[PDB]
Amino acid sequence: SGAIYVGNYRVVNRHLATHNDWANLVWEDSSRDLLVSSTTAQGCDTIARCDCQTGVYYCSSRRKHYPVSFSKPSLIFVEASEYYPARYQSHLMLAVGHSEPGDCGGILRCQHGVVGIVSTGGNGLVGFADVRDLLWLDE
Ligand SMILES: C[C@H](C(=O)N1CCC[C@H](C(N)=O)C1)c1nc(F)ccc1Cl
Ligand SMILES: [Zn+2]
């Protein structure tokens, strides 16, 4: 679990969005596993606007942060799950690091701010949904 709180927006994994997220829907994209809902309170976070390919992510299944080198956002094949059929997920970045399904929502940050959230993984890999191209989150 986990979310990004920036301005009057809450960014979560689309497959983990609540009834309240959908009732306050701003934007969603199944191909990216992202959903953004509106909030009444002002949020705590800064979005990175950069091309970093290194950063640190929070891994809830270890209660620890880990440094990562990650690929640039791209279209990656993701196997069918209970949430989606087998499909290409866009704007996904992969790295070597531990992850389990419940780690989705953990933030990836570089020195400039929030880069994305955990969205996929397995076998010593962790995948992050990029949010750096969503300029409207703070504009
Ligand atoms: C199976 C799961 C996963 O990647 N997804 C399920 C939930 C929906 C995901 C998606 N973005 O489409 C795909 C997973 N397995 C691991 F071994 C480690 C982490 C994770 Cl998240
Ligand atoms: Zn950066």
Side-chain angles (χ1 to χ4, degrees), residues 13 15-16 30 32-33 78-85 87 89 92 98-104 118-127:
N13 293 94
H15 74 274
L16 302 179
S30 177
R32 295 180 64 155
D33 185 46
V78 178
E79 208 174 348
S81 69
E82 144 99 46
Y83 309 97
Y84 300 109
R87 76 209 212 282
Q89 179 163 318
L92 186 62
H98 180 68
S99 68
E100 296 176 38
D103 287 323
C104 286
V118 175
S119 178
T120 73
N123 304 303
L125 293 163
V126 53

Side-chain angles (χ1 to χ4, degrees), residues 38-126:
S38 59
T39 69
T40 53
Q42 296 297 135
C44 62
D45 289 301
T46 284
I47 305 304
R49 304 295 182 192
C50 68
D51 64 353
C52 284
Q53 284 187 252
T54 64
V56 176
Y57 78 107
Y58 181 65
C59 174
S60 66
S61 65
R62 293 287 180 269
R63 290 209 195 97
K64 273 188 174 56
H65 296 261
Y66 292 110
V68 277
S69 289
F70 49 90
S71 58
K72 290 183 173 187
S74 72
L75 272 167
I76 297 182
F77 174 84
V78 178
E79 208 174 348
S81 69
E82 144 99 46
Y83 309 97
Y84 300 109
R87 76 209 212 282
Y88 289 93
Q89 179 163 318
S90 63
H91 300 261
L92 186 62
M93 298 174 297
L94 297 191
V96 178
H98 180 68
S99 68
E100 296 176 38
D103 287 323
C104 286
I107 281 172
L108 171 64
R109 279 183 168 270
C110 64
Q111 66 189 106
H112 305 107
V114 175
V115 174
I117 51 171
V118 175
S119 178
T120 73
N123 304 303
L125 293 163
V126 53

